Structures are given as C-alpha cells and as structure tokens.
C-alpha cells in the first residue's frame, strides 16, 4: 500500500478506563463483580515527528509541473469547511511532481 517498512515500528499505545465497582452486597459472595459504575474519559494528545528530507538540485532549463489549487470559482473553497461546518478533502495528492533523470 506504500509506506516505510520497519523492523521496529512505532510502539502501539493502549489505554483503558480502570473499572470501578458498584456497591457490593453485605454477605460475602465469591463470584465475579458483575456491575460497575458507568464512566468514560477524555483528554488531549500530541504527536511531534522529526522528518528528514532531500534537497532538490536539478539543472533543467524549463519549468516543471507543480501542485496548484483548482482555477474555478467554487461554492466552497478547497480543503475547507462548508456552510454546515464539515471539513472536506476535495482530492488526493501524490508526492510525485518534480522530475529526475532516469
């Protein structure tokens, strides 16, 4: 599917809500606790990645194809929300534009 094959990829990150039981009975019972307190959690996360990239030195005279926004006036600007507030990717973008000698 494309990507970077890794022998030792980034570690999976796993999270759970610690179970909190409801009020137990007064007489002891050895069975598992069936009923818990309904709860959920929320928060924020962050991801910071350092990318390495290769400079482009090419002596071709004439100009090259590059990625540009569409030239039509549209009802909704590209890669932007609509009236209802929904974000929309208008099309996929590949990374291959600049050329290189074979």
């Amino acid at each position: 599917m494309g990507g970077f094959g890794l022998k030792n990829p980034p570690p999976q990150i796993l999270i759970k809500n610690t179970p909190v039981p409801a009020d137990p009975p007064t007489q002891f019972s050895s069975q598992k606790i069936n009923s818990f307190i309904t709860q959920y959690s929320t928060g924020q996360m962050t991801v910071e990645i350092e990318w390495e990239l290769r400079k482009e030195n090419s002596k071709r005279w004439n100009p090259e194809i590059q990625y540009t926004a569409n030239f039509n006036n549209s009802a909704n600007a590209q890669f932007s929300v609509n009236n209802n507030g929904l974000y929309i990717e208008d099309r996929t973008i590949g990374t291959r534009y600049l050329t290189h000698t074979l």
Binding site: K59, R60, W61, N62, E64, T99, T101
Partner: protein
C-alpha cells in the same frame, strides 16, 4: 575558409574550446548504452568525437505519439560552469570507483 571551390585551413591562436565534466550526473547519461565513438583499439588511429544528444518523454497526440509532454525536460549545457581553454592551457580531473565485486 572557402574561396571559389577550394578550402584553405589556417590556425587561429586565440580561439578557445570549453569543456566540463558532470560530476553530479545532472544531465541525461548516455554512456553505458554501448554506442560508437569511443577511443579506437589501436593507438595510431585518429577519431572524431561523437555528438551529444538525449531524448525524453513523449506523449499521445491524436495520430502522433511524438508529441511532447508537460514533463519533457530541456537541458542547456551552457548553464553549467565549464572551463575555457586556449591552445596553451590543459584540462585534468581524477575519479575513484566505489567498491564493487570482482568479475
């Protein structure tokens, strides 16, 4: 110089030639394709240098697949920093192969 139908060859002392080597392989590389125009086998032969040229992507016109494509590259070799040589001065460079297995 040609007067009437005869040639007279003279020697211009102040004219130059200009030469460069492409170390970073930024031009299309036409060697290794087994063309002619190499040094002759026998040291007493005198040979004429071949012309340089390359060819690039073509594209599907109506009846023609020879139509250029937006990505067809045009390289101007004067946009390289060459070296201009009159008759007295000379040109040199060295090169080193990276490790390869024996044949």
């Amino acid at each position: 110089t040609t007067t009437d139908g005869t040639k007279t060859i003279a020697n211009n002392l102040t004219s130059t030639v200009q030469v460069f080597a492409d170390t970073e392989h930024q031009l299309p590389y036409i060697l290794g394709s087994a063309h002619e125009g190499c040094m002759p086998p026998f040291p007493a032969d005198v040979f004429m240098l071949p012309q340089y040229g390359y060819l690039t992507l073509n594209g599907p016109g109506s009846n023609n697949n020879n139509l250029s494509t937006p990505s067809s590259a045009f390289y101007c070799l004067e946009y390289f920093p060459s070296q201009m040589l009159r008759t007295g001065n000379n040109f040199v460079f060295t090169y080193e192969f990276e490790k390869v297995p024996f044949h």
